[PDB]
């Protein structure tokens, strides 16, 4: 039988994942989303230009709804008692590497359009796998998105990249009937993200991916 | 540019008691799918003359029934480790949203109460709950808890049992398929008292009823 | 009104209390799930319920899973109590979850990679039927490198299972469905989200979908 000891990166996640579920009791909701109009919005932007990914695109909406449900992007402090809510909506997106997991953070989302968000993610990925991500480039996420939905899955119950308060679960696009669906999932600090507040968000995010001719306004 | 926001009356009460919730009770939570077709037209008819009732208050009536079949799930955790205390009355925690936070109220002795007596209650217990007029009377010895979010959204959640009880039951949005109307159900519980198996055997033995309410007359 | 009743604790009950308390105490849990075209499997079972009793879903599954624990070695491990340790295991000894009157028991198909479909399915009843009668021996309940829990012999679409501590991964079997015009079923995974990352976890079950997905090829 072969062993090892906890190495560099694998060390960071060991201690941050223990912390994560050590401290924050998790609650998770899932919602079906008609990503049909979605798809053809991506299959149109792939032709007439370049880029956008399912991931990137979902990162363009996510802030604007964090804006609306304020409690969803805070972090939890040293101090039991307090919270620091956040008003600079910028996201992290977890990538697989060789050495381990990662979460580069694309700064103030709600100001880089969709194309950009999605080249940002690649520059930060194709480097993530080289692990040449300057330590600047991994801080200050108000909130995080995780997509297995490239590698597979249909539904996940993620662990909240601490010390954020929420994270979002992206997945494989599945073909039931004749319209393309994808389940999303949200896990969040149920010390503060209550019954409704939880859902009420995912349902709203749902509500947009499910009518993007709107996003325009 | 940030915002402090500590906590208040309730927030702080929920904080500690969610901390305390999922700190001791390890969580198995399972989901079955229910052909709630035959339940919906039950209700949708009672609108056309019977005044009520509600998806919840309906589940609430059957729920106790099925508890008496598997005692372990209507059981409260305790003080010292080493102690179990299952109860044999039935008061069901059913928890609405407020602007203040998550409130939870218990329909005392639901096993004696009527589909309507239940539902015509949850209403006057929750119109209050948001406008914050709810007596201590209305909030103590719960035996188990049900939590409808599908009046809002979602297909399935991973809800967290209300302490110190031992199981909980999530309800979520109702969707068409064939189109018969299904919706997913979920119940989470303590994996010390409720071995995985027997919880499943609870929701199916619930699932079954929701799919044969004719046969609720037993 | 009302009247409660204080119900104490026991050998096996209290050992479940423990394994469980201490399961989620330190295994911070992740869950993921895919859906399988179990339609091409399920029918295989059906040709062989006719001529060669028996073979199950649990049987079928048990005998594929290790060959997929081979590809990703990271989930076939114990979790160590000099804290920071590995014990990535390299032999496969698959666990099983089963309801016995007294409480949840587990047992192990010693060396799964060496046993054919039937033999394991023989062994499972020859142990469940004996855990039920509470006559199951100390060397049979040990050494599990990984465990499967089936509930869809009673129900469930999908559940978040709890690892048999101190293993490191668990796979959760469910009922089949009949979507249209196909027979699907949800599988589930739960693993220590440290010694097992984000992707990997799914990347795993997906390759396990893959070889339920086309059994026709699993002659070799």
**What HEC string does B21-34 produce?**
HHHHCCEEEEEEEE
Question: Rounded to an integer, what distance in angstroms lies between the CA atom of residue A93 and that of residue C191?
Answer: 21
- C-alpha count within 13 angstroms, C-beta hemisphere, residue A54: 21
CA distance to partner chain C, nearest, from residue B169 (Å): 13
- The residue assigned the tokens 């702080």 is B12
- DSSP state letters, A162-182: TTBSEEEEE---EEETTEEEE
Q: Is C33 on the interface with A (CB under 8 A)?
A: yes
Could you tell me the CA-to-CA distances from B70 to B67, B195, B206, C53, C101 in Å, in that order? Answer: 5, 12, 11, 33, 12
User: How many Cβ atoms from other residues are within 10 Å of residue B133's Cβ?
Assistant: 9
Chain C nearest C-alpha distance from A144 (Å): 13
B208 touches chain C (CB under 8 A): no
List the 106-165 stretch of B: residues with Cβ below 8 A of A.
147, 149, 152-160
Other C-beta atoms lying within 10 Å of the C-beta of residue A140: 13
CB within 8 Å of C126: residues ≥ 6 apart: none
Distance of CA A123 to the CA centre of its chain: 17
Q: Beta strand pairing status for B92-94 and B144-148?
A: parallel
Q: In this complex, which of B141, B158, B200 lies closest to C160 when CB atoms are compared?
A: B158
The pair of structure tokens assigned to B10 is 């309730």
Contacting residues for B82 by C-beta, under 8 A, at least 6 apart: C9
Could you state, in order of their start, the residue ranges of all structural domains in chain B? 27-216
Site of tokens 């217990």: B125
d(CA C107, CA B196): 15
Q: Which CATH number fits domain A29-209: 3.40.190.10, 3.30.559.10, 3.40.50.2300, 3.40.50.150?
A: 3.30.559.10
Decide if B11 contacts A194 (C-beta within 8 A). Answer: no
Helix (H, G, I), strand (E, B) or coil at B209: helix
DSSP A93-146: EEEE-SS-EEEEEES-GGGS-HHHHHHHHHHHHHHHTTT---GGGS---SEEEE
> What residue has token string 């081979």?
C70
Compute CA distances A201 → A163, B129, B150, B153, whole Å.
19, 22, 13, 9
For residue A60, give the H/E element and its range. helix A54-68
Instruction: Answer whether A190's CB lies under 8 Å from A26's CB.
Output: yes
CA angle, B146 then B147 then B152, to 5°: 150
Q: What is the dihedral of CA C197, A198, B32, C150, to 10 degrees?
A: 20
The closest of C32, C44, C61 to C183, measured between CA atoms, is C44
Q: Which of A29, A82, A190 sits opposite B154 (nearest CB)?
A: A29
From the DSSP assignment, how many helices (H) and strands (E) are in chain A? 5, 9
A5 exposure class (CB count in 10 Å sphere: 0-12, 13-18, 19+) = exposed
What's the CA gap between C101 and C134, in Å, rounded? 9
Q: Do A146 and C198 touch (CB under 8 A)?
A: yes
- Is C129 strand, coil or helix? helix
Report which of C127, C88, C83, C87 is spatially closest to residue C108, judged by C-alpha positions.
C127
Distances (CA, A) of C6 to B18, B90, B111, C3: 25, 16, 21, 11
Spell out the residues 6+ positions from residue A28 whose beta carbon is closer than 8 angstroms to its own.
A157, A158, A169, A185, A186, A187, A188, B157, B158
Whether residue C195 is preceded by a cis peptide bond, meaning omega within 30 degrees of 0, is: no
In angstroms, the CA A117 to CA A125 distance is: 12
The string of DSSP codes covering B48-91 is SSS----HHHHHHHHHHHHHTTSGGGSB---SSSS---B-SS--
**Approach to solving:** X-ray
The reply to whether B85 touches chain C by the CB within 8 Å rule is yes
Strands (E), chain C: 29-33, 35-36, 94-100, 103-109, 146-150, 158-160, 169-173, 185-186, 188-192
Shortest distance between the Cα of B190 and any Cα of chain C, in A, equals 9
CATH 3.30.559.10 fits B27-216, yes or no: yes
Cβ pair B113, B107 in contact under 8 A: yes
Listed resolution, Å = 4.0
CATH superfamily name and code, C31-217: Chloramphenicol acetyltransferase-like domain (3.30.559.10)
> CB atoms < 10 A from the CB of A136, how many?
9
Of the candidates A38, A15, A29, A11, the one whose C-alpha atom is nearest the C-alpha of residue A166 is A29
């Amino acid at each position: 039988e072969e062993i090892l000891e906890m190495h560099g990166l694998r060390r960071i996640i060991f201690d941050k994942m223990t912390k994560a579920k050590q401290i924050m009791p998790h609650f998770t909701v899932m919602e079906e989303v008609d990503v049909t109009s979605m798809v053809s919005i991506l299959d149109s932007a792939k032709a007439r230009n370049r880029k956008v990914t399912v991931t990137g695109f979902l990162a363009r909406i996510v802030p604007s709804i964090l804006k609306q449900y304020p409690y969803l992007n805070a972090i939890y402090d040293e101090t039991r008692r307090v919270y620091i809510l956040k008003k600079y909506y910028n996201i992290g997106i977890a990538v697989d590497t060789p050495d381990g997991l990662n979460v580069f953070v694309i700064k103030d989302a709600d100001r880089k359009s969709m194309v950009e968000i999605s080249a940002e993610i690649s520059d930060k990925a194709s480097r993530a796998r080289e692990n040449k991500l300057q330590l600047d480039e991994v801080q200050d996420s108000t909130f995080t998105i995780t997509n297995v939905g490239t590698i597979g899955g249909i539904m996940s119950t993620p662990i909240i990249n601490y010390p954020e308060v929420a994270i979002l679960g992206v997945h494989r696009i599945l073909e039931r009937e004749g319209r393309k669906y994808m389940y999303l999932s949200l896990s969040c600090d149920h010390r503060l993200i209550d019954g409704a507040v939880a859902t009420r968000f995912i349902v709203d995010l749902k509500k947009v991916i499910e009518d993007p001719n709107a996003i325009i306004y």
